[PDB]
Structure formats: structure tokens, C-alpha cells
Amino acid sequence: MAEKKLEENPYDLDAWSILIREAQNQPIDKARKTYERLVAQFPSSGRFWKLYIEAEIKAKNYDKVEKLFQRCLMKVLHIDLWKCYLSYVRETKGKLPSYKEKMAQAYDFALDKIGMEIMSYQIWVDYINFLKGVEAVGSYAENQRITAVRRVYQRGCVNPMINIEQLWRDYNKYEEGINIHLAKKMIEDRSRDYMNARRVAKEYETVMKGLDRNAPSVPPQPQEAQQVDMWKKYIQWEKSNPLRTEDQTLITKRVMFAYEQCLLVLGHHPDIWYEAAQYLEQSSKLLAEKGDMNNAKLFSDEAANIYERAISTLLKKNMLLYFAYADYEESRMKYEKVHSIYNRLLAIEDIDPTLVYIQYMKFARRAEGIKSGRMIFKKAREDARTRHHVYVTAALMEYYCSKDKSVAFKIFELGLKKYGDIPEYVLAYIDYLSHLNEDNNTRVLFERVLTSGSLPPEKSGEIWARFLAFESNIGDLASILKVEKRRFTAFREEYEGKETALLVDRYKFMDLYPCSASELKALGYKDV
Amino acid sequence: MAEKKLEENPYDLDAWSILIREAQNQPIDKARKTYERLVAQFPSSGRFWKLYIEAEIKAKNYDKVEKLFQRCLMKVLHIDLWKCYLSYVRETKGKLPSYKEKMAQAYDFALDKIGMEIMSYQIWVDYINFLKGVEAVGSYAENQRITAVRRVYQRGCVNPMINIEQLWRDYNKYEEGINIHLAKKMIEDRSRDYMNARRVAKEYETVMKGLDRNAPSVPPQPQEAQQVDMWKKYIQWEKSNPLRTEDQTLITKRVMFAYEQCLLVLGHHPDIWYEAAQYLEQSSKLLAEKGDMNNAKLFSDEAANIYERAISTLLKKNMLLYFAYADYEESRMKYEKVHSIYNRLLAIEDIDPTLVYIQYMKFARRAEGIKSGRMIFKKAREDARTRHHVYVTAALMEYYCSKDKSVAFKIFELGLKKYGDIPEYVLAYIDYLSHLNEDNNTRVLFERVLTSGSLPPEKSGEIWARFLAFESNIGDLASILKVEKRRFTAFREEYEGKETALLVDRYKFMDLYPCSASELKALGYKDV
């Protein structure tokens, strides 16, 4: 059963191709059910959205089609999905009296979001042909057509794409077509830019040939790391500024467009979402310097949107991008939003909130003061999910920021109470009291933790260790032998015969041992 | 070339068997040269000592033979080496007028150190036959012979060994031989002990069958771990008290005899020397309790000798046994000897004295006061060998014992001066200043170490890390971004593209990361 394969790997493309194979061996009423399941899984697959669209569109359900477009067209910059949308309009609206008006809008809307795609050539032509076609009676009318066609040609013949030449060719023949005289100069006047573009077109032509562009986006688990390689090159290529131009926004645009394409296939890579939002923040302030303020707060505002998208589409449970988000808004001093970001993450049913609380509570203190911080800490403690780590984080925070060894001891104690059976927690507590340097008290906590029986001896080895390390700094030989012999009695079982391998720890310091690697091996030594 | 094999593995038994194979294809003048080389390498090989002895003994150099015995007989408890010595006396002294007197001495000397060996049966007989043979004229003479023979029989028929039966057999026939009447009771009176022994003889008979006993002692580098297994069993067997007897000294004797045998083959295992000296110390105080004081200070004194031997024969450069030695004498409050032990180790040309100084200086303070300690520290600094570790050890010692942050800062500073290009050292220093909890000063040391250029940036990663960790506890987002961007500039090379894998460390705490194991993998994450 294909579903079974899916029970295992949800992204089993094999299973999906089967569901999709029979997706057609059935009416749009039963298929629709399977398609939703697909797009719901591969939201960024313009290819899948299309199977679904073409299927409904096959069934004459023009109403459901428009719905599907409003659901993906903006969100997915797939060259085909868009040429598809242009067709759906070319048909659907062809007989409306407002067609011309509406048709041009779509062409504009299209070239504006996807025209930069390397395989967009046709849209440009379809637009120009559409335009030449428009009926014009008189002269102010025809000449208005020229202004219109002239515009798409001029805009195209500077846009790096596969047939960038067949566009420049026909442009020439168009001017020459309305005036052989003035044409010469009309053309000569924009050739230096076209060359500059016809070139980048070729550079671009390469970087893309290796790339996939239709592969379903799948979480990382041979070729992906290979294709990953190719994408970043393309992204870098665009960052180096192929079109040797002083226009920064035209670089960011093209670099951002690349990040876009890439994310369609590698959208399950936090690093790329981040790296893309990093470039935006950068491009941003690099404009605040050269005086361009409006064109700047734009990228600044948008860079924040790269975060929203990422943690709202393909990576909803990803702490990395959340924190990276929270941080970004915190830098922009939007302390209000930062709160919302941390709380949306906490909002999610299943995650291990612990780190988030730790990250949230750290932002809080650091940005809204000691009480603000204690707010979060309080919520942290009231979340059944929160693990011991936060009481440690919090407690140290007092000590390290306030310099208060009271709230600290209390927070630890308040913790040792509820988490006193977590070796890592007890150690966290000990390690702290032990740097205060007060011998007796430390010795006290040691004896408690090892005698308070709330910590199962089987899981106390590290402690007994830390103890001897303590009885080794201060303290003396008899005190060491004492704790030592007790440590053995508690693990009499798994420590019988390993006395020597155990003795090794009585003397080693840092990378120094009183034995050779080979001697340690045969001893049965195990370094923690 | 065999020597070549030896150039590689000094303990290449193959090479040795070759040198030994041609060791005979040559006169004792040229062989002697090769033999010394052998025994010098396998000091505990009664088998090799014998090849050498029998070779010289073959050459009628009775003077050189006696020399070889005085060189190994006491030091090696090999059953054959001793039967060899008994032969060399049986011949060499056979015609001396004092022979009888001398011959009996050797038998006594033999049974006293080796008679407990499982394969000793013959020596006992050779002795008894020797005795019966002694001429006796009269009655006080003959009866004196009886007292003498009766004694070896009685002593033998209680000593667990292979033919323990053929000894009891002939004993019976001996009494019966001098009085069939009184014999009945003479025998019946010591049978309960003989049975008890004839039994243990069988138990012993087993434990030994698996063991080698002639394998050359070689440093650990399949069967050794297998034979290792068998030896400890035999040792344990003896510790459980086979002869169900209330005599503790007779247990220790037999347990100690086992440790002895074992060491002949596994003498390159520090753990066994130690484990043996541990049993002595134990058996010791376990006698100080039951009132037996003389028989106690004996084992106490000897246990110290197990250490001497070990670090003076097969393991001369072994810090473990030295420390374990120094400690033992320190427990016995012989603070004078402890000093000598640490200094003998230091005396050795090549070793990495650092740990020893650290171990010595720790004993010192802890047992002779703060100045005594500063003595050693001073020597430590005057040893060209001593590595950075001791200035750390020492400095912390002040802080942790004295509570003086001056000598500490000075010792560190005095150290940072000479070892300021050792990442581990700088970290040791930082980690300390950072638990004092004084933010500014720590920030100061941080900026120095990273700007004082005495530490090659290539080896500063950990620092920049500790820095961010510091700028993360106290400090704030901008301060983090700052150190962060600098950390990147310094490693612009190996960190380009790994920005995200790097960002991961900005948020992880203990075993918590803002990413899944699988997500971290594909990021190129590397946890320190």
C-alpha cells in the first residue's frame, strides 16, 4: 500500500506519484481530495499546484480554479504556474468587454513578479503580441500603441533571459517598421544596455542549467547537498552584481529573486531562510548610509517578513528561525512584536518549551528589566512541559546580573525540590555552589544530594566524581579515600575490578593522565 | 633482519626466538652477549634466565652461574628456575665436606619460597629422599633423621599440589615402616588436615590448567585479555580461602603467592601491581583489628614494597604507581619518603613532569602547609619540561585554599606571560576570572587575550566562544552581535557559509539546541 510507505516517510515521493497516478483515474470529486492532501504537503510545488489546477480546470469549475490561484499564485513563483494563470485569464476573460484592460493587468502583474525568471521569454512576447493586436483607430490611438509596445520591448531587452536576443531582434524590426530613419538612433540609443544584458543573460544561462527547479521540497535526511551547492552559487552570482550596475536595489531584487526560486525546492533548510533575511537586513542599512532612506525601510520591513514566512509555512516548529526572528525585531527595538513571536512558539502544542522560555526570559531581562524577566520565568514554571533547565538558567541569571545569591539559592532550592532526581540538574546546582568557593556549604550540598536519596544512586556517578574533585582541591588524602570508598560501595556492582581504571581519575588534570593512551585502554579506562 | 623487527616492536618475540635460535649456534662468549640482551628485556622470564644459565653451566663457568642466580633467583619465582638452582647445588657442592648441611639449606630455602607452587611435588620428594639418605649411626642419630623426614612429609601433606596424594601415600608407608602400631594413630592424627588439603589441591589443580605461566611479559597493545581473565580468577580463588581456615596470614601468603606468579607474565599491567598492594594494605589493617600487631606491620611494610618493585623493575616510568606509592607512604604519615618518591620520578630524564609536579605540589600543600607547596611550585617552574598546566593548578590552589585572589592573579598573570599562546592555558585563565563574577574585569581579560596578539587567531575559536557565552549571560544583543561579527572577521575564511551552523551556538544551552539532530547535521553543525 502506498499509504503505508507514507505511514513511514511522509515525504515518500514514490507513494505520492502513485496517489497522483490514480489521481486522474478518477473524477475531480474524488481526486480533489487527494490533491489537497498533496499541496498541503508540498505547498511550494508549482508543479503540484498545477496538476490540481489543470485537473479542476479540466472539469470546467472555473470558480474553484480562481480559488486555487488566490491560494498559491502569490506564494509560489514557479514559471509554469504563472504561465498557467496567464492562460486561465486568456480564456476565461477573453469575451468580457473589459478583457483588454484585464488582460494587460495580468501581463503586468506577471512580468512584475516572475518576468525576471530565466525562462520567461514567452510571456514578454505574448504581452507584446497582445499589445500590437489591440485595435487602434486614428493616430493618437496608434501612437499610443507604439508607446505601449515600445515599453515592453525596452523593458524586456534589458532583462536577462534565454531568448533575450530574439527579443532584441524583433524590437529592431519594430522600430524599423514604423520609421527606418529614426529607428537607427532609437536602437543605437539602448544597445549599450542591451549588450550588458545579453551578456548577463549568458552568465545567468549557465548557473541555472545545473539547477533542478521542480524537485519537491523535502526535509534534509548525495544530490541535495550537490544541488544545494549549485543554488548557493547562483545566489552568490547574483550577489556579486552580474549586471555591472550602481543600482543597489536592482541587485537586491535579483538576489532576492534567487533566494525565492531556491526556497521553492530547499525551503526546508533554516540556514537559507536565515541567510536570505541576513542579506535583506544588510542591503537595508547599506542604503541607510548612502542616504536612500525610503528604499531602505522597505528592505528592513521586508527582511522581517522573510522570517514570518519561514516560520509560518515550511518551518513552523523551528526554534532557530523564531529566535532569529525575535532577535531581529528586538534589534529594531520593536519589543512588542518580540513578545508575540516568543509566545506564538510557546503556543504550539508540542515542542520542548524549555529552551524557548530560556531564550524568551533572556531577551526579557536584557531588554525590559529584572521584573519583566521574572514574568516569563513565572510562566515557564506554570507550563507542564518546561524541564529543569530553566530553573538553572534563571537562578544563574540572578547571580550573574543582580549579584544576588539569595534569589539564586532559592531558585536552585526551589528547583532541587521538583527536579532533584535529574543528575544534570543536581550537577548544575552543585557546579554553582562550588564556584562560590565556600568549602563547607558545598560539602553540605554534596552530602545532601548523595544522602537525600531523591536521586537514584545508579544515576549519581558524576556527582561522586564532582565530589572527589572537590575533596581533591581543598580537603585531603583521607577525605579523598573516604568519599572514594563510599563511591565504590554505591556502585559495588559495576565497579568491581575497575578499581585501577577508577584510580586514574584521582590524579588526572585536564589533558594530563598518569598513564599512556595504550595503558589506559587495557585498564578499561573511560573518560567523562 | 631480526634486529629490524626489533627496531619496530622491541618485544617482537619472533625476533627474539631467532636471536635465541642462533644464540646456541655460537660459543658462550658471543651468546652471553645476546642473553644479557634478552634477560634485560624479559627480567621476569624464568625460562630465559634458564637458557642463559644452562648455557653458561654448559660451559663449566660455575662462577658466572652463581652470579646469574644471585641476579634472578629471588626476583623470579619460576618453578623451573628453582629446580635448576637445586640441581646446580646438587652438583657443584656434592663433594664439599659440608654438602649435607648446605644441601638441606637449599631445599629449605626452596620449599620456603616456591614450595607452594602447584608443580613443586618433586622438590619435596628430592628433599625427603635426600634426608632418608643421610647416614646415621646409633639411635639418637637415626631418630633424629625420622624427626627430620617426618617433618617434610607432615609439611608437604598439607601443601596443595599435583601429587599431594603420592606424598601422603609414601608418608603412610614411612610411619608403618618404623612402627606399624603407632603408625595407625600417627597417620589418623593428621588425616583431617590432609583431606582438607588433598581437596584444595584439586580446586587449585583446575584454576591453574588454563593459565600459561611461561609467556614472556609484554606491554599491553585476544588471548592476553583471555589469560588476564584466568589469572584474576586464580587470584580471587585464593582470596576466597580455599583451605577453609581461620588463619589469615596463611591466606594472604597464598593470595600473595598468586599475585607473584601472575606478575611474571602480566607484570606490565599497573592495575595488577596496584590491586596486589591493595590486598596487602587491606590484609594488614584487618590484622591490626584482631590484635595481631606484629604479623600486621609486616604486611603494612611489605605492601609498600610491592610499589617499590613495580616502579623499579617492569614499570619505571609509570606515574600511576608512583602516585599510588607516594599516596600510600603519605597515608602512613612517612612524609619524608613521599618526597623521595616524587623526586625519583622527576629524576627520570624523559617524562612530562607537569602532572607529577601537580601531584607533588598537591601532596605538599595538603600535608606540609602552604609554604612547603610553594617550594615544589618553584622547582616546577625551574624545570624546562614543565608545561602550562602547573601554573593553573598552583594559581587555583591559592584561590581554593588560601582564598587569596592576589597570588592567584599573579600566578595566572605570571603564567599568561610565558604561556599566553596556549589556547587551553588562556581558557583556564579566563574560566577562572569569569567565575569571580566581575563583568568588567572579565571583559578586560577577554579583549586583551584577543587583541594582545600573543595568541594566534587560528587558535582562538574557543575564546571567542567563551566570550559570546559571557556577552550572553550579562551583556546584551548588540554586544553579542558585536563580538559575533568580530569572531567572524577573524575566521572569515573557515566560517564563510557556516553562519547558520554558527548561529546555533548563540542560543543552545546544555543539551538544548534550537534544532533537531537531523537539522543540525545538514547545517554542518559541530558541537564543542
UniProtKB/Swiss-Prot annotation, chains A, B:
Keyword Endoplasmic reticulum: no
Location within or outside the cell: Nucleus
Alphabetical keyword list: Acetylation, mRNA processing, Nucleus, Phosphoprotein, Repeat
The HAT repeat ranges on this chain: 26-58, 60-91, 98-133, 144-177, 202-240, 250-282, 298-331, 333-366, 437-473
One biological process term in Gene Ontology: co-transcriptional mRNA 3'-end processing, cleavage and polyadenylation pathway
Entry GO CC: mRNA cleavage stimulating factor complex; nucleoplasm
Function field: One of the multiple factors required for polyadenylation and 3'-end cleavage of mammalian pre-mRNAs.
Quaternary state and interactors: Homodimer. The CSTF complex is composed of CSTF1 (50 kDa subunit), CSTF2 (64 kDa subunit) and CSTF3 (77 kDa subunit). CSTF3 directly interacts with CSTF1 and CSTF2. Interacts with FIP1L1.
Protein name: Cleavage stimulation factor subunit 3
Protein species of origin: Mus musculus (Mouse)
Covered residues, full protein: 21 to 549 of 717
